[PDB]
Design an enzyme around this catalytic site. Structure first.
Site, PDB file in Angstrom:
ATOM      1  N   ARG A 129      17.064 -12.182 -54.961  1.00  0.00           N
ATOM      2  CA  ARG A 129      17.841 -12.994 -54.026  1.00  0.00           C
ATOM      3  C   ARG A 129      17.108 -14.290 -53.694  1.00  0.00           C
ATOM      4  NH1 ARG A 129      18.469  -9.474 -48.904  1.00  0.00           N
ATOM      5  NH2 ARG A 129      19.926 -11.112 -48.217  1.00  0.00           N
ATOM      6  N   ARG A 156      29.698 -10.243 -51.796  1.00  0.00           N
ATOM      7  CA  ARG A 156      30.787  -9.423 -51.259  1.00  0.00           C
ATOM      8  C   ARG A 156      32.179  -9.913 -51.682  1.00  0.00           C
ATOM      9  NH1 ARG A 156      26.547  -6.646 -51.380  1.00  0.00           N
ATOM     10  NH2 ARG A 156      25.440  -6.202 -49.426  1.00  0.00           N
ATOM     11  N   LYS A 176      18.124 -18.525 -44.602  1.00  0.00           N
ATOM     12  CA  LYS A 176      17.593 -17.240 -44.110  1.00  0.00           C
ATOM     13  C   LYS A 176      16.428 -16.776 -45.001  1.00  0.00           C
ATOM     14  CE  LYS A 176      20.964 -14.283 -46.592  1.00  0.00           C
ATOM     15  NZ  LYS A 176      22.285 -13.574 -46.470  1.00  0.00           N
ATOM     16  N   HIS A 177      15.512 -15.922 -44.520  1.00  0.00           N
ATOM     17  CA  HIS A 177      15.489 -15.332 -43.177  1.00  0.00           C
ATOM     18  C   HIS A 177      14.248 -15.844 -42.419  1.00  0.00           C
ATOM     19  CE1 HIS A 177      17.562 -12.490 -45.912  1.00  0.00           C
ATOM     20  NE2 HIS A 177      18.324 -12.164 -44.871  1.00  0.00           N
ATOM     21  N   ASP A 200      19.849 -11.857 -37.776  1.00  0.00           N
ATOM     22  CA  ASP A 200      20.249 -10.905 -38.810  1.00  0.00           C
ATOM     23  C   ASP A 200      20.907  -9.731 -38.070  1.00  0.00           C
ATOM     24  OD1 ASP A 200      20.486  -9.535 -41.263  1.00  0.00           O
ATOM     25  OD2 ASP A 200      18.367  -9.704 -41.755  1.00  0.00           O
ATOM     26  N   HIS A 256      15.847  -3.335 -43.326  1.00  0.00           N
ATOM     27  CA  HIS A 256      17.025  -2.483 -43.176  1.00  0.00           C
ATOM     28  C   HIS A 256      16.624  -1.078 -42.732  1.00  0.00           C
ATOM     29  CE1 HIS A 256      18.812  -5.627 -45.809  1.00  0.00           C
ATOM     30  NE2 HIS A 256      19.925  -5.322 -45.166  1.00  0.00           N
TER      31      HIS A 256
END
Ligand code: NA
Length: 331
Positions: free
Chosen positions: A140, A79, A170-171, A257, A183
């Site tokens: 990832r 980000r 994580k996770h 999360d 998600h």
């Protein structure tokens, strides 16, 4: 002043981390509700990191310093890339770099995050997987071999830590082999006895390298959480605290999360109910990606205290853990 002597509602607000859209949104949530943390995401106007506004808001935060968090993993989840440069995905790093090189990359990027006022990075991913690159975990992950994950994620965490950024593993207890994307809906992992020999391996050494935090994901784990998302199941936190996961019992900060936008949670529980369930189960920090719900959430948490749905001890222990990774009280 004294941590234990704060107003009940401000103790509760210290257990929340909320996504903000811009400086005005962050300024209001911090001053009006004293939330312990704000999160920077794809939904955030990043000018607040370079125009002095984050610094101004952080300096007036009370009673505890403000935590400022972000998903900065590299690759598909970066980000801050527009400001700190892009980095290859975790998987590409493991393929093209030595662990010492990854340490240096994480250190350099950690310092760049600190310059922007970031205090917490939700990285490294310690999920273990061989899935296609552009899947929920995919590239990832540092690898399909838990020993490789331990080496490389360990290096990445160490680099962030040496920059003074709090890294978050994580996770937990492992999204790498889950049945789909949390998600968008509920997902299931392999059974606990399988996770014990694979997905949980990196935590055995990495949780003992402090400071470090852990984020619990929303997967359902057979033999552990039944049909409950792991983030909302006491069994998950007991596993982490007791050392049942195969490493020393973890006494540091534990995040959830995202509790609001993720289908594994939101299809079953509204934000206030999800936050309550998380803190009941054993999370120290309930994370979601908007500020609108904060007063309703705090209202529900106070009611849970009164009804005994939420024990005072759970709040106090988590308040201490949140304070322990921050600077001094502001009296
Ligand atoms: Na707690």
């Amino acid at each position: 002043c004294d941590l234990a002597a704060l107003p009940a509602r401000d103790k509760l607000a210290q257990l929340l981390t909320v996504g903000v859209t811009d400086a005005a949104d962050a300024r209001a949530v911090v001053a009006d509700h004293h939330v312990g943390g704000i999160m920077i995401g794809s939904w955030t106007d990043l000018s607040m990191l370079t125009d002095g506004s984050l610094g101004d808001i952080a300096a007036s935060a009370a009673p505890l310093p403000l935590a400022v968090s972000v998903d900065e993993e590299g690759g598909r989840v970066s980000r801050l890339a527009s400001l700190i440069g892009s980095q290859p995905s975790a998987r590409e790093l493991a393929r093209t770099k030595t662990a010492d090189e990854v340490y240096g990359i994480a250190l350099d990027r950690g310092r760049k995050m600190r310059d922007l006022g970031v205090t917490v990075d939700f990285a490294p991913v310690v999920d273990v997987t061989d899935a296609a690159a552009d899947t929920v975990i995919g590239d990832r992950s540092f690898g399909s071999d838990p020993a490789v994950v331990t080496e490389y994620a360990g290096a990445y965490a160490r680099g962030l830590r040496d920059a003074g950024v709090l890294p978050v593993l994580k996770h937990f207890p492992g999204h790498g082999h889950a049945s789909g994307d949390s998600h968008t809906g509920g997902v299931t992992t392999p059974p606990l006895d399988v996770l014990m020999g694979d997905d949980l391996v990196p935590y055995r050494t990495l949780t003992g390298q402090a400071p470090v935090a852990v984020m619990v994901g929303h997967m359902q784990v057979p033999g552990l959480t039944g049909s409950d998302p792991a983030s909302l199941s006491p069994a998950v936190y007991n596993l982490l605290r007791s050392g049942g996961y195969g490493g020393p019992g973890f006494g540091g900060l534990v995040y959830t999360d995202d509790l609001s936008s993720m289908g594994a949670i939101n299809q079953r529980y509204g934000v206030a109910d999800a936050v309550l369930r998380a803190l009941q189960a054993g999370a120290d920090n309930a994370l979601w990606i908007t500020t609108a719900e904060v007063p309703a959430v705090l209202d529900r948490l106070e009611q849970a205290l009164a009804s005994g749905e939420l024990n005072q001890g759970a709040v106090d222990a988590s308040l201490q853990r949140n304070a322990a990774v921050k600077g001094p009280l502001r009296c």
